[PDB]
Amino acid sequence: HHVKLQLVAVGTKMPDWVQTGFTEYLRRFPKDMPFELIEIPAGKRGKNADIKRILDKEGEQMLAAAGKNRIVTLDIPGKPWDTPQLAAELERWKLDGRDVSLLIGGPEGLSPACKAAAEQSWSLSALTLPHPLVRVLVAESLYRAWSITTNHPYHRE
Amino acid sequence: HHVKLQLVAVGTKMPDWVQTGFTEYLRRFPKDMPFELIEIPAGKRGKNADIKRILDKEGEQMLAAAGKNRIVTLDIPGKPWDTPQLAAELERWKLDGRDVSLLIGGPEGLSPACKAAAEQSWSLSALTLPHPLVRVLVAESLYRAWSITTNHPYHRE
Ligand SMILES: Nc1ncnc2c1ncn2[C@@H]1O[C@H](C[C@@H](N)CC[C@H](N)C(=O)O)[C@@H](O)[C@H]1O
Ligand SMILES: Nc1ncnc2c1ncn2[C@@H]1O[C@H](C[C@@H](N)CC[C@H](N)C(=O)O)[C@@H](O)[C@H]1O
């Protein structure tokens, strides 16, 4: 009937130029496929901090936010989908019908539980990208994919 | 003995938030290794226009701009360097000493001449990225690679 694309991400307070771009893609998604952002609190890093405990804590909050959604992690070693392939996946997610949680890890990455829960995993790049740009890249690529499905003018290059 | 990184891009309109992001990274490159933008005016797609001819004209100009430089194309089918490899490429480019021209194609992509002129081709993603994001990604990823080489904090933030 409609499928929410929900970005579940660690971190807060992105640079304005980033927040602006991200918002520009976000507001162009149609009402029958809304794109939304859920931010998970980043664990307090520091000296003598237990990284592993923090990752686990972040993961548990992310899994709580995904609920019974399709879970797709953004991970460098995931599937290197090209744009036609992503359009196909979006169609797949539509047929599935469950809202989609797209998980983006914090500074230290995704918890093992999050990687285990993934139904699919998606690689944007072989590069190590900074979290804010990952947010913008997910918004645009999915928008482009959406447009291909609806024969919208943005994708015709 | 500084080495120049010249982004040779088919001239395009950049949204303000993209322009801000792009300059933010660009501004942080050392005098040791300058990051530079050189736009090539995009041809107009008139009625009945022969696309192939339009493209060649775009390319010839790119190559004229590249000159004697090492020519690296940004192309989806190119080498999907990870961030470690990109730092290693950066080191190779320095040993060369020769300036690098990094080519970004117009709406129709790179001219066959540009693709042929390439000593190396570099893929950011399997995805079809919009021209302005390609600029920001190149600036940030090259910055991250450089950061590694000098043990600058950015890479290890
Ligand atoms: N190439 C990529 N493809 C898909 N997801 C990515 C990619 N790079 C980073 N991510 C996501 O971004 C998250 C990690 C980023 N916060 C990495 C920044 C980290 N602080 C560092 O210094 O590089 C990872 O958990 C992934 O979920
Ligand atoms: N994933 C990528 N990796 C490297 N360069 C890219 C990538 N995506 C886009 N570009 C650059 O952006 C330019 C314009 C592209 N939108 C052209 C699209 C491409 N001709 C296609 O149909 O998939 C291309 O000529 C490339 O130089």
Residue numbers in the entry:
A (entry chain D), B (entry chain C): -1 to 155
Paper text:
To gain insight into the mechanism of RlmH, we determined 2.3 and 2.1 Å X-ray structures of E. coli RlmH with the cofactor SAM and with the SAM-mimicking inhibitor sinefungin. This conformation resembles that in other ligand-bound structures of SPOUT family members.
RlmH consists of five parallel β-strands (β2-β1-β4-β3-β5) sandwiched between two layers of α-helices: α2 and α4 on the solvent side, and α1, α5 and α3 on the dimerization interface.
